[PDB]
Design an enzyme around this catalytic site. Structure first.
Site: not given
Ligand SMILES: *Cc1c(COP(=O)(O)O)cnc(C)c1O
Ligand SMILES: *Cc1c(COP(=O)(O)O)cnc(C)c1O
Lengths: 411, 411
Positions: B139, B221, B257
């Site tokens: 990412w 993450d 998400k």
């Molecule tokens: C969406 C995402 C994030 C950060 O998400 P937010 O809540 O929008 O800040 C971090 N890492 C990965 C791999 C993501 O897919």
């Protein structure tokens, strides 16, 4: 083996919030919270503005809203409207498409993004040596925000005159006259924190003359628009004056206090540049800065503000709510001062009515403050700063007597 | 004349977000948004989860709530519960009181706070030379966040194998073997973004063995817990394995998400330390970091989550909502493999099905991608990364076809 965190020192908690926590756990029936800069009703309770409650219900009944990511820079309606309130609808800057706005996480988030941008692109490239000037004294977080963004040289400008209990205009101007060109100055738009002492319009004009001449950068912190005098226009006088004088500047605006939206973290960073292209370029870089900090901003708070500002009826109701808060504080200023005087408290107390916004700088020394806390259960900042909003018709006598004891018995 | 911003260059816009902007602006009726990692229903619309909808009503009707500032570290009930969800109710780390949580602005905010902490206090003091490893590929914002935090040495570990269309375990391990002790590794908990390829549990055990021996720091993450498989417990296996293996680590959680709360910026940084004392000292430093960034976090999103997690009934409903989303993605993968396969399109596609989460690393090279974007009107990342949630029973073939073309015509 040994923990990788073994050598990490214990940092003390942020003072203002710790003061609140201490207050909450105190069981004394006479307790008073004059610490954090938050509004309280005459019943000593938090107050959700009537207009806010109203918009909240609107939002909750609107099945058409979704939770998709907002653009990095923020909710468009919010951004435009926020800058309009700060600069005025008839602002020359708005007419000339010379204003940009970035949604920030409260006034603090707006300041941080502005600091980060300057450290990278202002007065050179990655120039961490540009001096940054804060008032003496100033809200604690100013220094911290700028140092964390990378600035190495934070200085102060004369401001509070303890002997006179007022503005040290001459020293302020002198410090500005000797500041290196391009220096960054953090200016409180109105309702100075923590003194409550502001320059008059005539004094502001003197300030602007020096800043223009020496190319000093005005970085306004506007966290109390409306709160000060009950009038959004009067409270923005200084900011608008600088815009009209042709400066390029930043204005960190908070809606925490004027909307009572503390926990929804709504702020806006207004960028006023020479022209449209320049502001657009600034914005494009700020998008990269935001992206690595919070990615994109929350929506609840921004939506409440945008809805209120765009509806004529809601806008009028908000102005009324703001004037209610400002008038209450005026009343408390008048009432405390009167009591202090009739009690025969040593010193002069006119600064209590001369001061503006939430705070008053009492003049109490650290031992006197300790007494107020430990013995009287009156919570205030170590600097002797008091939140006038914590005062009520029911606790006035107690607080005034406590101050009297502190000045007389602790000396 | 000559703005102080004259020489500020125009920065390119953030890719994923730019892609959505373009899409919205596009007029072609065959328009397919296969960009941003956001869920969509079969009708191609955003989905506000039913449980979220219920809680939002609950909140709006609760007249006892106020908008006073939350503590710097976050809403207590949110903090506790969020970590519980990542580590499991029976986590010995939680029982031993050696888990600490910091509310963050989405997963991004959580990562940022963690990065800022590490740079100041881990592997020495203000040691910006500690290498930070990201997967190849990863990412985009991972690099950016760590660089912004002050780290100067960002490296990559092998991950994706273009030839095998899967995980390059040997390369990855080799990269770890050769990494200097104490290096920081950014690991995707599950549903790797953007490949959709994750290590199996046995591969994870192998990864952990090398990390343990070389004292590598695991920075998880976790943006898709519940999306890789529809099970919150299954998806959290690797993080929990590391905890059981005695590692000290950080886990940046995102609720953007799994709760569909993209725009409320709800995240949590879980810190797992050797003991309570260590985690308490780490948190005291995190409080000072948060103070200068956003000051204190917003309440809305966190309240929604905490309320959901603390009610068994709401919690069960949430789990059902999460499964609905996961299942719908499984369907689309299943299906894709079909249209592509059955439709005489060349290659091995068991990756589409072995791949987990929102994304599939297709294979489309830049020009096929451009093909897909310019003529067809299917917006996707430049990498060949498609968002499975973009697929639908009514856009299906038109998309499979398109890919068939790019792999036929334009390649
Ligand atoms: C969406 C995402 C994030 C950060 O998400 P937010 O809540 O929008 O800040 C971090 N890492 C990965 C791999 C993501 O897919
Ligand atoms: C309250 C305050 C801020 C910060 O406002 P938030 O919206 O809580 O971040 C900044 N500056 C001053 C002078 C303040 O009083």
């Amino acid at each position: 083996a040994a923990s990788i965190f073994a050598a990490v020192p214990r940092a003390p908690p942020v003072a203002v919030f710790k003061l609140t926590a201490d207050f909450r756990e105190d069981g004394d029936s006479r307790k008073v919270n004059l610490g954090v800069g938050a509004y309280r009703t005459d019943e000593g309770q938090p107050w959700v503005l009537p207009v806010v409650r109203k918009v909240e219900q609107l939002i909750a009944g609107d099945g058409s809203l979704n939770h998709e990511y907002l653009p990095i820079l923020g909710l468009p309606e919010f951004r435009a409207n926020a800058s309009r309130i700060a600069l005025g609808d008839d602002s020359p800057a708005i007419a000339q498409k010379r204003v940009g706005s970035v949604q920030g996480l409260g006034g603090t988030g707006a300041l941080r993004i502005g600091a980060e941008f300057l450290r990278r692109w202002y007065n050179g490239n990655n120039n961490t040596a540009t001096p940054v000037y804060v008032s003496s004294p100033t809200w604690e977080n100013h220094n911290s925000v700028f140092m964390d963004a990378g600035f190495k040289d934070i200085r102060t400008y004369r401001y509070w005159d303890a002997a006179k209990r007022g503005l040290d205009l001459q020293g302020l101007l002198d410090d500005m006259e000797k500041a290196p060109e391009f220096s960054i100055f953090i200016l409180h738009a109105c309702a100075h924190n923590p003194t409550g002492t502001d320059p008059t319009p005539d004094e502001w004009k003197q300030i602007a003359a020096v800043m223009k001449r020496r190319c000093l950068f005005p970085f306004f912190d506007s966290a109390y628009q409306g709160f000060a005098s009950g009038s959004l226009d009067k409270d923005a006088w200084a900011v608008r004056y600088f815009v009209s004088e042709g400066f390029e500047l930043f204005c960190a605006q908070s809606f925490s206090k004027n909307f009572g939206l503390y926990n929804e973290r709504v702020g806006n960073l207004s960028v006023v540049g020479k022209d449209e292209d320049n502001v657009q370029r600034v914005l494009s870089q700020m998008e990269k800065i935001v992206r690595t900090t919070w990615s994109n901003p929350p929506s609840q708070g921004a939506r409440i503000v945008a809805t209120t500002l765009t509806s004529p009826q809601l806008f009028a109701e908000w102005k009324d709510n703001v004037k209610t808060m400002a008038d209450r504080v005026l009343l408390m200023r008048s009432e405390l001062r009167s009591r202090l005087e009739s009690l025969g408290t040593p010193g002069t107390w006119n600064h209590i009515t001369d001061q503006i916004g939430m705070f008053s700088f009492t003049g109490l020394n650290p031992k006197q403050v300790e007494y107020m806390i430990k013995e009287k259960h009156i919570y205030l900042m170590a600097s002797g700063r008091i939140n006038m909003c914590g005062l009520t018709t029911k606790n006035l006598d107690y607080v005034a007597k406590s101050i009297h004891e502190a000045v007389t018995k602790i000396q």
